[PDB]
Design a protein around this ligand. Structure first.
Ligand code: FES
Ligand code: FES
Lengths: 64, 67
C-alpha cells in the first residue's frame, strides 16, 4: 500500500533538497510521514497519523 | 494503513537526529519511505516501493557546501 496519499502526485518521485548553510533554526524537523501541511517540514501531523493507524513514525531532526 | 512496517516497532515514535557538524558528505540522502536497510539513510529502496505500489516517494537530500 501507498505511503504518500496526496503530495505532488504529478511528480513521479518527490525529492527535497535542504541547503544546510541556510538553516535559520538550531533545531529543524523534517517530515517522514507525508502528511505535513508544511512538507517537507514536520508540523506534528505524524501524531494524528500514528493515532489513526497505530503507527510509530516521526521526523528527522537537524541540529546546528 | 501503516507507513512503517518494520523499523523499531517497539518504539512509540521513531525520531532520528542529525548533528549538522557530523555530516561528512556534500550530499547525503535520508529515507522518507521506511524501507531502507540503512535507515535513517536512504539506500534506494524507495524505488522498489514506488514500482510495486505506484507511489512517488523519495528521500530528503542534505546538501552541505565544501568549505
Ligand atoms: S508531520 Fe510528518 S513526520 Fe511530523
Ligand atoms: S530508501 Fe527510503 S527514501 Fe530512499
Amino acid at each position: 500500500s501507498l505511503i504518500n496519499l496526496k503530495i505532488q502526485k504529478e511528480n513521479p518521485k518527490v525529492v527535497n533538497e535542504i541547503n544546510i548553510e541556510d538553516l535559520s533554526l538550531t533545531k529543524a524537523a523534517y517530515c517522514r510521514c507525508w502528511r505535513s501541511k508544511t512538507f517537507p517540514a514536520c508540523d506534528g501531523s505524524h501524531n494524528k497519523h500514528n493515532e489513526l493507524t497505530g503507527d510509530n513514525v516521526g521526523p528527522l531532526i537537524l541540529k546546528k
